[PDB]
């Protein structure tokens, strides 16, 4: 859902 | 039926069906129902085909009184062009620029300079709206604690456009602060 | 000699030699001098290998008193990690996030919120520094009229770092203007 | 040179 959006953010951390 | 526009439309349609990795001239051939060496008369290979696709997407959407309005609309119409098809962004990467596109670059620069942007700042500004937009769409085009929860609920409801516009606005206002004299 | 760190180092070395498209487990195998099914015991396929690469690059460089300092250094250390290897940026795309990385996301959010960022604005801010950085490196990693000439001379001399930093600065200042109360 | 940088800009126009 907006799940991938948050995945995307976490991915650069 | 292999008029240029039909090859292109068919390719775009294919891109949406299969995406950038999946798309191959072999399949393009097959879709159009012609033999591969016939297609090949018209289209050297995959790079050549991507290039026309990139350009064509831009021609449908890149259809764009102050510089803050130009910057903003500019970013927007670019975003839309990349969004227009599956993997549009990946497609656009590593496209070689056209004759018109350098013309346009010159124009945009003449304009911004004539708003008392130094040339340096003109470039930095286009560049950065440029990068930020591309950056956004690439990510939009991919595939247990409280703040993260709210942040799912949050983005569940809004999708990527509100964030994208925000950023852009921050950008241009950061530029505005640049524009004023020292410091 | 197929201890994890050696597989990874060898893969990274390979990436620089051949880039992302060129890199394949077959070649990895060959470089290490082992048979493919032996390598395969350790590494399911190419996606799995990219994922570890992405993570490892981030672990060497993602080593990062106000929020404007955190934002800025954050962007910088991310940029460096993507720059660290050929096609680093393409590599990082479509990596699935780790346990630590969600932890970190939570932290950064707790911090920015505790500087009187709404959660929305917290997200928009990370997101946008995020996109803009990625956007820049992707382009840095690729391949007759006057303003364009000066603009070649201009960029000939400076490369991508001065522009990149500029953008970032504009960004954060755009955010600062956000931060103040209405309008 | 900084030629590719300008190519990159023109490419999104």
Separation between Cα atoms, residue B147 and residue C108, nearest integer Å: 10
CA distances in angstroms from B71 to B67, B173, C63, C141, C162, listed in the order given: 6, 11, 34, 24, 20
Separation between Cα atoms, residue C178 and residue C180, nearest integer Å: 6
Residues in C closer than 8 angstroms to A6, CB to CB, are 105
CA distances in angstroms from B122 to A11, B56, B105, B136, C40, listed in the order given: 32, 26, 11, 22, 51
Q: Is B62 annotated as a binding residue?
A: yes
B72-75 contacts at long range (C-beta below 8 A, 24 or more positions apart) = B72/B168, B72/B169, B72/B172, B74/B108, B74/B129, B75/B129, B75/B132, B75/B133, B75/B168
From which experimental method does this structure derive? X-ray
Residues in A closer than 8 angstroms to C95, CB to CB, are 11
Contacts of C58 (CB under 8 A, 6+ apart): A12, C78, C81, C92
Token look-up 């510089």 returns B67
Out of D1, D2, D4, the one facing C143 most closely (by C-beta) is D4
CA C166 from centre of chain: 18
DSSP code at position A8: H
For each of the domains in chain C, give its residue range(s) and CATH number, in order of start: 1-64 (1.10.10.60), 65-183 (1.10.357.10)
Separation between Cα atoms, residue C137 and residue C88, nearest integer Å: 8
Out of B142, B143, B152, the one facing A2 most closely (by C-beta) is B152
CB of D12 less than 8 A from some CB of C: no
Residues in D closer than 8 angstroms to C156, CB to CB, are 1-3
Separation between Cα atoms, residue B4 and residue A6, nearest integer Å: 41
Token look-up 């680093």 returns C88
Residues in B closer than 8 angstroms to A3, CB to CB, are 152, 156
Nearest CA-CA partner of C41 in C5, C91, C7 = C7
CA C28 from centre of chain: 23
Q: Checking phi first, is residue B46 left (phi over 0); if not, alpha (psi -120 to 50) or beta?
A: alpha
Q: Is there a contact between A12 and C127 if contact means CB atoms under 8 Å apart? A: no
Other Cβ atoms less than 10 A from the Cβ of B110: the count is 13
CA distances in angstroms from C91 to B71, B107, C14, C28, C47, listed in the order given: 30, 35, 13, 16, 10
Q: Is there a contact between B92 and D13 if contact means CB atoms under 8 Å apart? A: no
Q: Is there a contact between C160 and D5 if contact means CB atoms under 8 Å apart? A: yes
The residue in chain A having the minimum alpha-carbon distance to the alpha carbon of residue C124 is: A9
Q: Is there a contact between A10 and C105 if contact means CB atoms under 8 Å apart? A: yes
CB of D13 less than 8 A from some CB of C: no
- Helical axes C119-140 vs C161-179, angle rounded to 10°: 170
Residues in C closer than 8 angstroms to D3, CB to CB, are 152, 156
Q: Is there a contact between A2 and B159 if contact means CB atoms under 8 Å apart? A: yes
- Helical axes B46-61 vs B25-32, angle rounded to 10°: 70
CB of A4 less than 8 A from some CB of B: yes
SS3 sequence of chain B: CCCHHHHHHHHHHHHHHHHHHHCCHHHHHHHHCCCHHHHHHHCCCHHHHHHHHHHHHHHHHCCCCCHHHHHHHHHHHHHHHHCCCCCHHHHHCCCCCCHHHHHHHHHHHHHHHCCCCCHHHHHHHHHHHHHHHHHHHHHHCCCCCHHHHHHHHHHHHHCCHHHHHHHHHHHHHHHHHHHCCCC
CA C66 from centre of chain: 22
**What is the Cα gyration radius of chain D?**
6
Q: What is the DSSP string of chain C?
A: ---HHHHHHHHHHHHHHHHHHH--HHHHHHHHT--HHHHHHH---HHHHHHHHHHHHHHHH-----HHHHHHHHHHHHHHHHTTSTTHHHHHTTPPP-HHHHHHHHHHHHHHHTTT--HHHHHHHHHHHHHHHHHHHHHHT----HHHHHHHHHHHHH-SHHHHHHHHHHHHHHHHHHHSS--
The residue in chain C having the minimum alpha-carbon distance to the alpha carbon of residue B131 is: C135
Decide: B132 and B112 in contact? Cβ < 8 Å. Answer: no
Separation between Cα atoms, residue C161 and residue C178, nearest integer Å: 26
């Amino acid at each position: 859902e907006g799940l991938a959006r948050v995945a995307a953010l976490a991915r650069s951390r | 039926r292999l008029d240029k526009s039909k090859v292109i439309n068919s390719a775009l349609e294919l891109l949406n069906e299969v995406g950038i990795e999946g798309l191959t001239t072999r399949k393009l051939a097959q879709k159009l129902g012609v033999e591969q060496p016939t297609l090949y008369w018209h289209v050297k290979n995959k790079r050549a085909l991507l290039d026309a696709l990139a350009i064509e997407m831009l021609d449908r959407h890149h259809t764009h009184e102050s510089w803050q309005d130009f910057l903003r609309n500019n970013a927007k119409s670019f975003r839309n062009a990349l969004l227009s098809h599956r993997d549009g962004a990946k497609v656009h990467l590593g496209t070689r620029p056209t004759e018109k596109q350098y013309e346009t670059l010159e124009n945009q620069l003449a304009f911004l300079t004539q708003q008392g942007f130094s040339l340096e700042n003109a470039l930095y500004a286009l560049s950065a709206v440029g990068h930020f937009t591309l950056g956004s769409v690439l990510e939009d085009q991919e595939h247990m604690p409280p703040l993260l929860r709210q942040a799912i609920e949050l983005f569940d409801h809004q999708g990527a456009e509100p964030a994208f516009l925000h950023g852009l606005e921050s950008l241009i206002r950061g530029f505005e602060v640049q524009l004023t004299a020292l410091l």
